[PDB]
Design a binder for this molecule. Structure first.
Ligand SMILES: N=[N+]=N[C@H]1[C@@H](F)[C@H](n2ccc(=O)[nH]c2=O)O[C@@H]1CO
Ligand SMILES: N=[N+]=N[C@H]1[C@@H](F)[C@H](n2ccc(=O)[nH]c2=O)O[C@@H]1CO
Lengths: 440, 440
């Protein structure tokens, strides 16, 4: 009910759309009876007029319902189905440790993640640095892995929230990505199709974040929390910092290396630790695996300390067709770059500003990400040993160590790193890694 | 300069587009490098933010320049190149008499017209009721006809303002038709491609008009007048009445019959006469064929009275491959409907309201217009003997005479005519046929 153009006109003129109208439109997107022009027109009317809560809910549920929705009840698991999503960043590798940590604490994490977009890394691309790792197991194999290991990290198959495929593709060429209702519906259509009991959302704040201001990061978090809880998925959001690289590394193989060393306790970037732990705590509390923050933290620290989280990661890698000895032998499997060399600042001083969007784009330019979908990734390139805001840099502390595919590439990356970072004669003021928590 | 999505974003965020940006976008439409989604997105940003005068000018000129632009200088004609456009209506047959009248007064009228759209008739469809009449002469033949006869009425060929083809096609499925800058640019891209010295625009007001209110009809007229004069084409606009059928007939063959009888002086609907004459007067004054209204009217009345206008019409029909004896023998050439029968009102009274949009749609439903582009027209169907507002109707005066293709069709049309017309115990207040004139 019923006309695409009539629905566009209704929204254009500032009226709220009914659930029936929204479901009709989303169905028409799925079955290719509504054209790209019509999708773009509706998207733009939503950019201008926004959507009320009932509209946002309707849009999200219609997109979720446009394809396969997973259900876990019939496996009779003894734990909650729980997951995490991030808006994306640079060195945002939390999922590689968070999935195994929460699984080791009794959760089940059917994580449908994504490839890199724009300036941000993608969990699936990082995982594809592991030889043999399969992000596309078949339906029954995915179920087997979740049952046996407790976590798997996979791509979106053609049958999951298919209406979002054309919707996002159109948004991304028509300047209609940047809309809270559209983002909310797109994110949740995919995550709610996982058949969750609980969810935590990591919404980034800062120069490496998508939303341009703290207040808009906050509004997005509020929308996602509202919609997901309405669907009976216990959901909270954390607003977290992306004013510098989160991990000590940015790339693909380099970030997998960081995740393994974090799980084994060789090295833990403290900011990456704080965000990872905070997100895991939300998942345990919302999933009813812990009653409070202190209990949740104790459980999560225990699975790090006793090696259980690292073991779950190893089992996940093996289940998804990576090597069976990956945790112990990662160094032989992860590809090494042709040239690895530190980049030093031109002057002595404290790291004061870091344009994290520019750092992300430097990794793309190195071949560690894509400018078009057909682009091929070099899995070895990127940054390690990232200087942090407030670090004193000199001849003994570089800005970063650059891993490059050849020497010409290295020079371009070094210029970009230097250009993205400002030094000052004093360290900048501290900022929290987690600014705040949003609940129903 | 340069990015389609960047241009959409700029307009989305309320900035004015440069001439360079607008020309780039219109070129991208023409060469199919800018997608339907991107066209729809831009169109919707223009719906919301409008366009300044420089933007409206840039958009119009870019669309005009996207294809062939005619030039008449090289034929060394001794008269102005002048034309008329109407927003459309029901019984809006003025062009069939206006072209020949102005040609008989020394103007040259290269009229690129259109088919019916929505509820309104189309000059090209009316002309295609004349057997053999060719709305698509080749370029050199069109030039020959203009030189020899002074007027021809033709369709838009694939090479004329081609950017408008995809632009209008997208607007018409995305609720972005109803935008003054977009309408202005679309109308003028085609008319200015005719290589005009002068132009008159007929913008309709009322229930059969496109713009929903008098004030918006006025704003549209002002935009068209502003843009066209800026391009060095001396342009004025008349706001004219479409609160009832303008001619005494609505359809295709029936309206051609009315045009011939008007030219020969058998019968002249006075309202149709007033609008036709007023538009012709604008063309003579703007084309410098007359210095004032009284002189213009005298010249136009003379070519009616001496048979010269009717002769030009006959010569135009013959030149465009219709019959050589069409004026004298039209009755044998124009197709007759299967059933012609008057429809009487259910009660006695004065014709008080006539929903002219509904009357137009009744003609479409009869098969006299199209609901989809592939629809085939029955050229014989429609209305004649239309009652006018303020007419007393009874057993001796029907609401209309309906020409139908079979009897089932007739009954449906009779119901629709009765439904579209309200009677009252008193005649409604007079309204002008021409509300006002807009000049630079
Ligand atoms: N916050 N935020 N927005 C980012 C993300 F949330 C949003 N996005 C990504 C992928 C997707 O499928 N749907 C979708 O809506 O686009 C932005 C760029 O990545
Ligand atoms: N006034 N007005 N608007 C009418 C007309 F001016 C406008 N229109 C028609 C044809 C076209 O090619 N371009 C174009 O813009 O669409 C409306 C429906 O016919």
């Amino acid at each position: 009910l019923f006309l695409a153009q009539e629905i566009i006109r209704k929204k254009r003129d500032g009226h709220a759309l009914s659930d029936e109208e929204i479901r009709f439109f989303i169905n028409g997107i799925r079955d290719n009876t509504i054209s790209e022009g019509q999708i773009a027109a509706l998207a733009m009317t939503i950019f201008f007029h926004d959507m009320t809560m009932p509209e946002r809910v309707s849009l999200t549920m219609a997109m979720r319902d446009s394809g396969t929705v997973l259900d876990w009840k019939s496996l009779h698991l003894n734990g909650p189905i729980v997951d995490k999503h991030s808006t994306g960043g640079v060195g945002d590798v939390t999922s590689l440790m968070l999935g195994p940590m929460v699984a080791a604490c009794g959760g089940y994490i059917p994580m449908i993640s994504g490839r890199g977009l724009g300036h941000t890394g993608g969990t699936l691309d990082k995982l594809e640095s592991i030889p043999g790792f399969d992000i596309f197991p078949d339906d029954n194999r995915f179920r087997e892995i979740i049952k046996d290991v407790g976590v798997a990290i996979i791509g979106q198959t053609s049958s999951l929230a298919p209406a979002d495929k054309r919707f996002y593709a159109t948004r991304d060429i028509t300047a209609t990505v940047d809309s809270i209702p559209l983002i909310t519906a797109s994110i949740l259509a995919k995550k709610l199709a996982e058949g969750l009991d609980a969810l935590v959302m990591d919404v980034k704040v800062g120069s490496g974040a998508f939303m341009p201001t703290y207040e808009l990061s906050e509004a997005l978090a509020e929308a996602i929390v509202g919609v997901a809880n309405g669907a009976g998925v216990r959901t909270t959001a954390l607003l977290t910092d992306m004013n510098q690289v989160l991990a000590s590394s940015a790339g693909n193989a380099v970030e997998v290396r960081e995740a393994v060393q974090f799980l084994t306790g060789e090295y833990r970037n403290p900011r990456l630790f704080d965000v990872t732990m905070a997100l895991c705590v939300e998942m345990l509390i919302s999933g009813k695996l812990a009653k409070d923050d202190a209990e949740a933290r104790a459980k999560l620290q225990a699975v790090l300390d006793n090696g259980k989280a690292a073991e779950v990661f190893g089992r996940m890698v093996a289940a998804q067709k990576g090597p069976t000895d990956f945790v112990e032998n990662y160094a032989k499997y992860l590809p090494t770059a042709m040239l690895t060399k530190a980049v030093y600042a031109d002057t002595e001083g404290f790291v004061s500003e870091m344009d994290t969007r520019a750092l992300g784009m430097a990794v793309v330019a190195m071949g560690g990400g894509r400018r078009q979908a057909s682009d091929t990734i070099d899995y070895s390139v990127g940054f390690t040993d990232m200087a942090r805001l407030g670090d004193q840099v000199d001849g003994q502390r570089p800005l970063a160590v650059i891993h490059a595919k050849d020497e010409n590439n290295w020079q371009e990356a070094a210029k970009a790193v230097k250009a993205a970072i400002k030094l000052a004669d004093k360290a900048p003021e501290s900022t929290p890694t987690v600014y705040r928590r949003i609940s129903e």
